[PDB]
């Protein structure tokens, strides 16, 4: 009985492969051969803030491009002004093992999560004037990897037990569960339209999910190792992926195959974090060799390089208008570059 | 303006508080527990005093923070770097699993020990090996032979000889004999001197680190 199912799956997978291969008349490398290159790109530091004392693992910009939140293993979240290098709030934590942080679009809430398997939500604007814990969402059997806000009363998260979740905040109950992966889910990024979201897993696969309905729409393959970070194009019809085998890839949701890859014979170390920039001309990535790189989205030729840290770059961020970057690394320092 | 100066002053105050907190917290010793299923993983943690479980205890003006991560059931490689700077790893091995099978449990424990010891993140990290259950080991030896687990082993039926052989074969797998040291101690269900053994081990590690870091050698 099961042999019939296995052979049907094999035949239908072969059919899918043939269908994708029969619609591959052109490639981006051949088409984008007469365009003018950007040239050499150089970037320099602009501010340096030194409040932390241990490895920084997360950082997320605010909506106004002025306030930011940073998370490190010392057991504290810090709120910073990127303009005057002051600190607003110092939030203690119950668990020191954290791996993600987020900022609400309205600016009223922050979120945290890690190896303690619980997503914690804090509210900033309160009448007393001190930050107080609000909600503690639990129900995951893995470990949290990323979490982003959609609005004031909804949030999505991804766990290491091959699942993702969407839940509302007033009642601490799961609303929708997304399943289908085989390995640990590593990163997710929400769409500008706030209707779909992409995710990357440990089995070299990327999936697209519908928020309202709740089943996987598309799957993408191509890498030979773990997927470590994901981002979203501003247009909303592309995304960029980084992996542990020293390469990046760019995908398209209306074509359903891989388009182009960034790699070099020199680079051996893996890629930890990725972030996209405005207009879709610059792609910024953090690597294991203590450096950050800037690439063109139109060709694999390398554009610019950045080196100002003494340890592994862990997190990368860009403001809404793509005018500067923030880099947090393992040397307990995070910097601003413009 | 005045507002910028007031914000600066609040920032400086919070910075002072953060530095004081970090100075306070940068003195406690951290330990990582590892094991294989039913072993001294639970008896030891009971004798010292969801995901990560933390145990805190004080011993002769040293604060010990012990992390148990056994209930993870995920990919170990992805979160193993978070424990990079830990002082030591307590590895628990079942001594009376030579007959039970679930592929022998002893082989699985040996494989886990080999994988953990030669990890890239734990290069200068010390490992404390705990042979967990021995009170009923004497009866199991006097009633059943040890040849089933080890066909090559040859020796008398004395518990001393078999224990020494097990200890030697488990310390054999250590690739590096100069960067790290492995310490071995036999524990019983009613033993109450394991805390002192761990204290001696950690103070030796601390004095060695202090000597090596800046001074001689």
């Amino acid at each position, epitope marked *: 009985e099961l042999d019939q199912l296995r052979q049907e799956a094999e035949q239908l997978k072969n059919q899918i492969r043939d269908a994708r291969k029969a619609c591959a008349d052109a490639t981006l490398s051949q088409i984008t051969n007469n365009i003018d290159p950007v040239g050499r790109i150089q970037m320099r530091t602009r501010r340096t803030l030194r409040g932390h004392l241990a490895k920084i693992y997360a950082m997320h910009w605010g909506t106004d491009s*002025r306030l930011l939140v940073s998370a490190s293993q010392d057991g504290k979240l810090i709120i910073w*002004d990127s303009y005057t290098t002051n600190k607003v709030h110092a939030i203690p934590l119950r668990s020191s093992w954290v791996m993600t942080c987020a900022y609400a679009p309205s600016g009223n809430y922050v979120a945290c999560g890690g190896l303690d398997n619980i997503c914690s939500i804090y509210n900033l604007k309160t*009448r*007393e*004037g*001190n930050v107080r814990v609000s909600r503690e969402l639990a129900g995951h059997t893995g470990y949290l990897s990323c979490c982003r806000f959609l609005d004031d009363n909804q949030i999505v998260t991804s766990s290491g037990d091959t699942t993702c979740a969407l839940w509302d905040i007033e009642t601490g109950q799961q609303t929708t569960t997304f399943t289908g992966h085989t390995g640990d889910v590593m990163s997710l990024s929400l769409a500008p339209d706030t209707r779909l979201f992409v995710s990357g897993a440990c089995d070299a696969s990327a999936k697209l999910w519908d928020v309202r309905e709740g089943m996987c729409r598309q799957t993408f393959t191509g890498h030979e190792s773990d997927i470590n970070a994901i981002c979203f194009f501003p247009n909303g019809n592309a995304f960029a992926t980084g992996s542990d085998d020293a390469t990046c890839r760019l995908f398209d949701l209306r074509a359903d195959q891989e388009l182009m890859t960034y790699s070099h014979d020199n680079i051996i170390c893996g890629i930890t974090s990725v972030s996209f920039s405005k207009s879709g001309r610059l792609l910024l990535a953090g690597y294991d060799d203590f450096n950050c790189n800037v690439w063109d989205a139109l060709k694999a030729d390398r554009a610019g390089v950045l080196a100002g840290h003494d340890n592994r770059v862990s997190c990368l961020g860009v403001t809404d208008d793509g005018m500067a970057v923030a880099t947090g690394s393992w040397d307990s320092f995070l910097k601003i570059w413009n | *303006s005045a507002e910028d100066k007031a914000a600066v*002053e*609040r920032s400086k105050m919070i910075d002072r508080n953060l530095r004081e907190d970090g100075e306070k917290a940068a003195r406690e010793v951290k330990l990582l527990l590892l094991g294989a299923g039913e072993s001294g993983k639970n008896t030891i943690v009971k004798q010292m005093k969801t995901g990560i479980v933390e145990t805190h205890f004080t011993f002769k003006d040293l604060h010990f923070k012990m992390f148990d991560v056994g209930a993870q059931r995920s990919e170990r490689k992805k979160w193993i770097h978070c424990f990079e700077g830990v002082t030591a790893i307590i590895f628990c091995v079942a001594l009376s699993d030579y007959d039970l099978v679930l592929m022998n449990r002893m082989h699985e424990s040996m494989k886990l020990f080999d994988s953990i010891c030669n990890n890239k993140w734990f290069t200068d990290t010390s490992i404390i090996l705990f042979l967990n259950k021995k009170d009923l080991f004497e009866e199991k030896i006097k009633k059943s032979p040890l040849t089933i687990c080890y066909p090559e082993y040859a020796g008398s039926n004395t518990y001393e000889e078999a224990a020494a052989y097990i200890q030697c074969q488990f310390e054999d797998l250590n690739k590096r004999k100069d960067t790290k040291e492995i310490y071995t101690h036999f524990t019983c269900s009613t033993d109450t001197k394991n805390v002192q053994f761990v204290f001696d081990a950690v103070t030796d590690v601390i004095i060695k680190n202090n000597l090596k870091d800046c001074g001689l050698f």
Partner: single-chain antibody
Amino acid sequence: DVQLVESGGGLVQPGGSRKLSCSASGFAFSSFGMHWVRQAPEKGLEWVAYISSGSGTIYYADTVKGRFTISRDDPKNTLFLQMTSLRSEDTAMYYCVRSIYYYGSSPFDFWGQGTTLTVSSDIVMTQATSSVPVTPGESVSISCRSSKSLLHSNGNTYLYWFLQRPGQSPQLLIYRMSNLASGVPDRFSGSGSGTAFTLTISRLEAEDVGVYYCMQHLEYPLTFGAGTKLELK
């Protein structure tokens, strides 16, 4: 929730000394700096003193520079004010205002009850208007003039609008230009520019009776205006 009470004040002979106290309960007193405001029995508002969080910067005025003492204690959540000499001009009622300072902070958000005491260069704002007859259902405008420009190189101004209903402590409406307060309907809007600013109210109501006050936060010497009464016949 937030509650601040003040005690101390009465009949005192000239030349004496007096101590006033202010207490709070349940608003994280250790993270709030305080200011003192003195209002004359006739009209007008003045600035007395300022204490910072952590007993840091302490500021006074020109008249009360060498005679006033301001101090606080974070434990028990208390502040004290010590008067060394009392003159004929020291008859007024005083109010204690809380404030916190960061990017999105709203200084001068809460006021106490105030205490009445009887004894028995610097920028100038004019606010020439004194009273404008009004009726419910229409829109009104109140203008205010300033001596020097309040537009800092930061890109923002420092303009405070306050409303004092008769029999009530002042509340906050517009702590900074084109920025509303909390607990206030959206019918208020400053929308000022240059040096002379304005305040527009689209619709009136029975609770819109009181006096309006303008305040500048560029130089720490603080001066208020004269007020603009709305009789609302």
